[PDB]
Design a binder for these strands. Structure first.
Lengths: 100, 54, 89, 63, 79, 90, 89, 79, 100, 90
DNA sequence: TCTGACACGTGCCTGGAGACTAGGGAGTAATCCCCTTGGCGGTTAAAACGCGGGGGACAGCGCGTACGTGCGTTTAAGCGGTGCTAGAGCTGTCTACGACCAATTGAGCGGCCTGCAGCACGTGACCC
DNA sequence: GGGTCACGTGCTGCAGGCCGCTCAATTGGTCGTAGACAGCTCTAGCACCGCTTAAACGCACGTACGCGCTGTCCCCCGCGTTTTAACCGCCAAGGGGATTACTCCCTAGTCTCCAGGCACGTGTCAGA
């Protein structure tokens, strides 16, 4: 991780790639490549979730913020389309035809 | 006999604190910024938020 | 008038709209048909409650759209059935 | 001898009390219908009533 | 028995409202209960099967998660 | 085991003044686990399809491209590529 | 009357209802967008065509049902859009 | 270019009839062509990606089968 | 296969289980149990498909017969609900509302 | 490798007076591979969930119950149980 | 009578079957702790029940267009035939990396203790 | 003696520091396979040409369906009142799961041998 410049671990990633019968062999680059990917995706979600917290004057992230951050982003929403989030809530969507 | 006067005094002092504490919680509820807090605010913070709000 | 207010209110909040106690009993009522004398963790029940409401809400949304397509305001079982059939149920 | 250290802690407790006292004076002086000699409980009580009144008035102007 | 009635008409109305429903016919309540019953049976049956396979008597959240996961539904926060 | 340490460090890097709830953290851990399974599964399948016994950055890259949507796929690949080049160089 | 006989005939038979050369050109027309100078196996292209026709048949069935729910016989894009939305498309 | 127009109105009629459609509005032909083009594009992109990963120039049936399979659509008869 | 009273190969099933990255180890009885299941399911389809061929006055089974057998049988239809069958065709379903 | 020999033999034992077309046989071969993967996949997951390194008839029997519908599962499970019983007895 | 499929006959190799050995994993047994389950009492909110009015849904009627259907004319697809190359497939050879095994070191985490800060309580001083 | 304010004490929680233990990262060495590279051959796919038939395209006419408009009745919605359950708080007991330790068996790996399976070819039968 230190040489890779990552916050996320590599050694455990390597362990997890060779474990679970994914392959007979794993290359040195694979654990590293993946660790970078996992960190990247994590950072993007945290950035959006933090914004959702700020919009509501919060300094702390909660499941509601995570839900809002994801559903407002079509790439994440598709990626996590089949995912249910505890206490995430729902978006305040009302059909125009129902309005007076 | 007169020992009761000191016991009464400490109870009066607590009653004063309880009255102030009850008012502090009520005061906090009237400041919109307090709505963003989950934990109960400290006495000093509530008073500061009230003046900042006004 | 009230219905729109209720929709906004319930969509805004995150808590369950169902009652927990009859839900817990219902889980055992059903589970007992598969196996008797079962024990359950409360976290398992809570997980079910979240899934159940999310499931029904999605169906309600589709049901509402079906009624709208037919240019109607009220929802009926026929609208639910169309959505369910299209969704493979 | 270490009892002397408690004095610094006593000062810290005093500092907290003094911050409260300063805010009481500011809180009371920031209200309409200002009056002298209000006690700490009265200042808070009048602050509560003011904020309820302020909230009521701004709410009264709408809906 | 009869715990499904424990979810009352007002509860159904609240759920429908969350789903954006403005107007509800009187036949919805029975239809909704039938639908939920099927959903619960499917998830519970799988969760119980997982519990039995492990030779356990206590059902855990993970049995529910596995039951949902194989049904194309994952749940974050519960494990 | 958990990623809470790493998630928090990243959160601090992005949002130095923002904390995170335990429930939100549990959700983030489930997210990471989900992504791992998706990529590791696909990388294995790619190796299977191509009659390979090993996993390299190529299998991971292709799995990332297949799994992620347009913008995420491009950026995730870039991050993986640099990390391997940088780690390999060091 | 004509439509029903046509439906029966096409449901009875198993042949492809799309001409092959137009289909082959369409596949190459698309594939070139991803990479130029590609070569294709004929069996691969036919596999695509069978999947495509099966897809459209499913779309048409649901589209027709949506029109029927609306008490109409003629199918419109509006009906397709509802069916596609319900199925998550 | 423009081979989507190669799917003639009669071709649409035949397909719609196979799907049990009795009557067709004039706007269906264009809507159907738009949808089909998008559907096919997604399938091909996956098949081409497989071909590219293997560093091949020729797309094979298995690239298509894998593409369809990963999308949820399992095909029998082509392997 | 002879010992188990099965037509299906036991060795092949064992080899596939042993070398398919399903696990580190496979029990000796597992291939036998599975081979029996696969044979049974195969027989169910063949019995119905043979009937479908007979109903069309055919002495040979074609993809259409498989399609007819599968989609009429609810258990098979659910099992193969998303399966596409080459030259399978479609079932002759017409909505009554469309009829004169 | 293929299953055409076994599929044909079973058909003859059920319907002696009919055969299988080339296309129909290709479909049956595709079917067998699909079913094998489904059961083996679930049996693998069961072993994973319970932290076991060995797949036995128990994991397969459970996988069969999870995958197949009630009536079909009962018959499929009975055949599997009998085959093992007969096999170990012979 | 011919074409395709099925049955019969022939040949070669791989995989399966059978046999033997060892270590690790699985299975079994015993002990301990926590959570779940079960029970009781009280308070508040929700649910249930009843009444009245309006809007929505349904039914009926009328009109016009687009679509459907048929006929004639024009074009492309499909079928059959011909020719050539690149890529794919197969075989053989060589190297580096990873795996496996062993040995060290540093940093971080967890647990415990200390220091600082905060909350609540008691006493003294001031005012009436 | 009562109430408020000011001052000091006691207890608890959070943050920081220290101690102990573990894992990962780092370092070093050996061996083999898989992957990569090189060379050679063949097929399938791609490209090109010609002819015929069926389909597509274009044009014309009429009808049914869809759309728009109007009227009536019933159900649902909204509010108020009453009753019950849900929810909250507190207390107790038992079982299952969790944790630790020990023993036995099976599969995998290794080794050996044969037939059936798989592929190919020929002849006859069934269907065309």
């Amino acid at each position: 991780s230190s040489r890779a410049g990552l916050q996320f671990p590599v050694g455990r990633v390597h362990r997890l790639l060779r474990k679970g019968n994914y392959s007979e062999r794993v290359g040195a680059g694979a654990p590293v490549y993946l660790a970078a990917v996992l960190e990247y995706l994590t950072a993007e979600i945290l950035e959006l979730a933090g914004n959702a917290a700020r919009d509501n004057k919060k300094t702390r992230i909660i499941p509601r913020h995570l839900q809002l951050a994801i559903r407002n982003d079509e790439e994440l929403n598709k990626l996590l389309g089949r995912v249910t989030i505890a206490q995430g809530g729902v978006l305040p969507n009302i059909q125009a035809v129902l309005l007076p | 006999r007169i020992k009761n006067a000191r016991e009464a005094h400490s109870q009066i002092e607590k009653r004063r604190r309880d009255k102030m504490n009850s008012f502090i919680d009520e005061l906090a509820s009237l400041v919109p910024t307090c709505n963003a807090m989950s934990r109960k605010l400290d006495k000093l913070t509530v008073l500061r938020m009230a003046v900042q709000h006004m | 008038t009230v219905a729109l207010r209720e929709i906004r209110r319930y969509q805004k909040s995150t808590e369950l709209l169902i009652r927990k106690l009859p839900f817990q009993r219902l889980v055992r009522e059903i589970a007992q048909d598969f196996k008797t004398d079962l024990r359950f963790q409360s976290s398992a029940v809570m997980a079910l409650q979240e899934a159940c409401e999310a499931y029904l809400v999605g169906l309600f949304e589709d049901t509402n759209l079906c009624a709208i397509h037919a240019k109607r305001v009220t929802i009926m079982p026929k609208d639910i059935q169309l959505a369910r059939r299209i969704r493979g149920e | 001898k270490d009892k002397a250290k408690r004095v610094s802690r006593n000062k810290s407790e005093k500092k907290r009390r003094d911050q409260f006292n300063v805010l009481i004076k500011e809180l009371g002086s920031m209200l309409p219908g200002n009056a002298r000699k209000m006690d700490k409980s009265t200042v808070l009580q009048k602050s509560i009533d003011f904020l309820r009144k302020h909230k009521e008035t701004t709410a009264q102007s709408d809906a | 028995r009869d715990n499904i009635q424990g979810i009352t008409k007002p509860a159904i109305r609240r759920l429908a409202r969350r789903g954006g429903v403005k107007r509800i016919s009187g036949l919805i309540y029975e239809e909704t209960r039938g639908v939920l019953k099927v959903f619960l049976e499917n998830v519970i049956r799988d969760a119980v099967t997982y519990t039995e396979h492990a030779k356990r008597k206590t059902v855990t959240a993970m049995d529910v998660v596995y039951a949902l996961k194989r049904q194309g539904r994952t749940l974050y926060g519960f494990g | 085991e958990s990623y809470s340490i790493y998630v928090y460090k990243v959160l601090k890097q992005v949002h130095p003044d923002t904390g995170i709830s335990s429930k939100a953290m549990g959700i983030m851990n489930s997210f990471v686990n989900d992504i791992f399974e998706r990529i590791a599964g696909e990388a294995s399948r790619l190796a299977h399809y191509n009659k390979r016994s090993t996993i390299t950055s190529r299998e991971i890259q292709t799995a990332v491209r297949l799994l992620l949507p347009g913008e995420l796929a491009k950026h995730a690949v870039s991050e993986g590529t640099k990390a391997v080049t940088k780690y390999t160089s060091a």
